[PDB]
Design a protein around this nucleic acid. Structure first.
Ligand code: ZN
Ligand code: ZN
Lengths: 115, 114
DNA sequence: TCTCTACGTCATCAC
DNA sequence: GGAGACGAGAGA
């Protein structure tokens, strides 16, 4: 049977990672490798990777899991993105980890000068 | 036999003003009173009256006439609004002609600095 | 007769 | 543990 791409052992994949994000990765390995597999909210994607609404809203560009908004079911649904997708796009947009670091720098300077 | 609300004479109303904007106004009167009946583009409404996309996009707030964009039919459709509607909303938003001209004054000062 | 949205940055409120 | 305010470029 098909084996998890991290451990090469487990045959039972994490239902979310597999069904939503198309990753043959078991639940244990996903918890051991959050640098790849962690789920990030839409707000975390904007804050951490400087991605915009038009990017994150593009269904052709990212897989996403939706859930009820934890603050209230009447508020806009929560949107969860897999770190490895988010990061891969962000590194392309910004010029790798380095460029992203540059952009983070450039916005902190922003607020200092803006009081 | 219903008469134009400007002249009280003509019974043939301007098709656009009547059908689209629901105004019983003849075409001659519409050209004689542009302060009421002139059609303004979406761009002109933003420029002249400081209305936003959310305001002008609101189907329940303004009547509007759409035409093909005159630059190219592949561009987004032109949208025309009637001055008397747009102005009445702008006057409410900004506090009469007084307050609108103030906003003008303000916005203009704002870019002077920049 | 031009129109829409990317670019901001973030408070607010969605209930 | 998400969806409008002030103002060039591509094409709704
Ligand atoms: Zn595994
Ligand atoms: Zn008349």
């Amino acid at each position: 049977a098909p084996k998890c791409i991290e451990c090469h052992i487990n045959i039972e994949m994490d239902p979310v990672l597999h069904d939503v994000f198309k990753l043959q990765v078991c639940k244990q390995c996903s918890k051991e490798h959050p640098e790849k597999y962690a789920l990030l909210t839409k707000t975390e994607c904007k804050e951490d990777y400087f991605l915009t609404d038009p990017e994150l809203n593009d269904e052709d560009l990212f897989h996403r899991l939706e859930k009820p908004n934890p603050h209230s079911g009447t508020f806009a649904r929560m949107q969860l993105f897999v770190r490895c997708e988010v990061e891969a796009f962000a590194f392309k947009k910004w010029g790798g980890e380095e460029g992203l670091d540059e952009e983070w720098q450039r916005r902190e300077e922003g607020k200092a000068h803006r009081r």
